[PDB]
Ligand binder design. Structure first.
Ligand SMILES: C[As](C)(=O)[O-]
Ligand SMILES: C[As](C)(=O)[O-]
Ligand SMILES: [Zn+2]
Ligand SMILES: [Zn+2]
Ligand SMILES: [Zn+2]
Ligand SMILES: [Zn+2]
Lengths: 331, 329
């Protein structure tokens, strides 16, 4: 209600500061970092890359990130705790399920998944005592039967705990509409929900409609714009053809409609990435050498020079995340 | 060489004794036991249950089991080590991949997969220093492109280390002939390979032809039967409705054909099972309350009753697994 759980323990809302609400230390798979750390060089190398990355973002003004890696994205909260401490950057951990659940998850009922998400929020992740502060869910297309189960379990776990829900969808399919329908059917307030990867599209009427319903809008893939990589047979499905400035102007466009309170902005960056083709990290790092500093270093100045006042930018990057992450059951 | 890796370190083959070559402590998914131990009651409850079960198998004569759980079956080698030591039963751990690889595995090349299998055999599993003594692979009747990468990497790891390969098949679909072809294209000797779940079929022509090529034949799900449970679709789908005696008669059948040296026998049992419907473990434990002791307590006397000589049964339960597990270049 006033405290947010991080991988170093609870913090007050005022301690969160400039918060990146959709990031990853490492995009992987359950068990993978511990079974095959040499895939990333070593555990130590990955840790060190992350601490440098977070220290870079911290010098650009960032104070907290939300690592939205779930169980099936190979979240290792011990790694998150280690990196957080060494970089002095708060990290909020996530529960939920992304798009690669193993059989032991895919065969579970909504009631069972609800208990799993609740365990991670109320008791702790694994045997670490670290509690999740957000629920991450993902869907494709019009929402598969299992994904619907995940979304309902997420809503139930949110309703019991006050922690918010953040989603990945296919914005080019206006996938947020179907997510919103399911959440509302469960009695979840839209102000507990961020509809994300929303900058994957240029359909502003869609985004405005969601914000008008009280949904947070996650404009979280701004540096995923590539430009120059059409020779690559995997850098158009994970990156982009439009510029990052195009994506960033969506931020301005929602502000102007009166919805600055509904906007969350992030990089959707990571320091290791095993759930994709080999060497993808060298590709991504060359396209965005700023990493998690891209928002404070490129996007914030770009908006400032398009006329957005300081107080609005602080509203989006400090106030909005604090309101979102503070556990609440009140609408 | 004459020693094999177990979760308590290297043993001599003479120490393996009566060996069950296809078992599990817990059938799960990577990361799952550690993230959600309450699914099994608790980690402690699961360990206890396994130790009670292994101790009963030991009482019945079992000395070694091969836990063919892979990374993606949720193998927790620390759990295996804990229950091995407490039951005082040797457990051989596996590398390889089963039928649920996560993206971080299924996007890998055959060279990469070879490196991973070799790490688990030559360096150790995770950070435990425990090394795998067998490579487990699984395919779906018609082998997928990714499963074919997995079989080629398994062959390559086997050729580099001498450790054997054991497979999960759709035996009703003759899965072993496609596997065998890939393995031989890589130069793998059939004597390094067990074509498992082969008791899932009564096609003796298929079994005997692989046995004639020098493959080991895994008749390794003998107690799996949903007879009596036809009103349970999930248990019927999993266990089949062939009787355990039907499965067991294939052991006699292959002996009768002259292939006693190629038979490996097991229960394919487990003490927790999250990668199927909820409470499946209670259903399995009512079908087979003997658990992993089913082979020595029920199958062996059944075979002795049908006239199989004791020396032949000892050769199948002791000598054949020893020959199979012993690393052989
Ligand atoms: C790990 As991702 C590419 O869904 O943000
Ligand atoms: C975990 As199984 C049913 O493939 O032996
Ligand atoms: Zn995503
Ligand atoms: Zn992401
Ligand atoms: Zn199997
Ligand atoms: Zn098995």
């Amino acid at each position: 209600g006033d405290r947010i759980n991080t991988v170093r323990g609870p913090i007050t809302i005022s301690e969160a500061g400039f918060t990146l609400t959709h990031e990853h230390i490492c995009g992987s798979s359950a068990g993978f970092l511990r079974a095959w750390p040499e895939f990333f060089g070593s555990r130590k190398a990955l840790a060190e890359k992350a601490v440098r990355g977070l220290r870079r973002a911290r010098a650009a003004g960032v104070r907290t990130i939300v690592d939205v890696s779930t169980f099936d994205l190979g979240r290792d909260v011990s790694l998150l705790a280690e990196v957080s401490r060494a970089a002095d950057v708060h990290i909020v951990a996530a529960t939920g399920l992304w798009l690669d659940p193993p059989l032991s998850m895919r065969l579970r009922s909504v009631e069972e998944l609800t208990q799993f998400f609740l365990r991670e929020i109320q008791y702790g992740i694994e045997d670490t005592g670290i509690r999740a502060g957000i629920i991450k869910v993902a869907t494709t297309g019009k929402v598969t039967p299992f994904q619907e189960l995940v979304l309902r379990a997420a809503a139930r776990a949110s309703l019991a705990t006050g922690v918010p829900v953040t989603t990945h969808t296919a914005a080019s399919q206006r996938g947020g509409e179907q997510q919103a329908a399911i959440f509302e059917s469960e009695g979840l307030s839209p102000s507990r929900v961020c509809i994300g990867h929303s900058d994957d599209t240029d359909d502003l009427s869609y985004l405005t409609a969601l914000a008008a319903r009280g949904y947070l809008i996650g404009l979280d893939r701004i540096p995923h714009s590539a430009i120059g990589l059409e020779d690559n047979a995997s850098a158009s499905a994970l990156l982009g053809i439009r510029s990052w400035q195009t994506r960033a102007l969506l931020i301005k466009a929602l502000i102007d409609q009166g919805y600055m309170k509904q906007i969350l902005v992030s990089n959707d960056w990571l320091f290791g990435f095993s759930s994709y083709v080999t060497n993808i990290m060298d590709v991504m790092d060359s396209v965005n050498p700023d990493g998690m500093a891209f928002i404070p270093l490129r996007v914030i100045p770009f908006l400032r020079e398009k006329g957005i006042p300081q107080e609005t930018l602080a509203g989006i990057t400090v106030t909005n995340p604090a309101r979102f992450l503070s556990p609440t059951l009140r609408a």
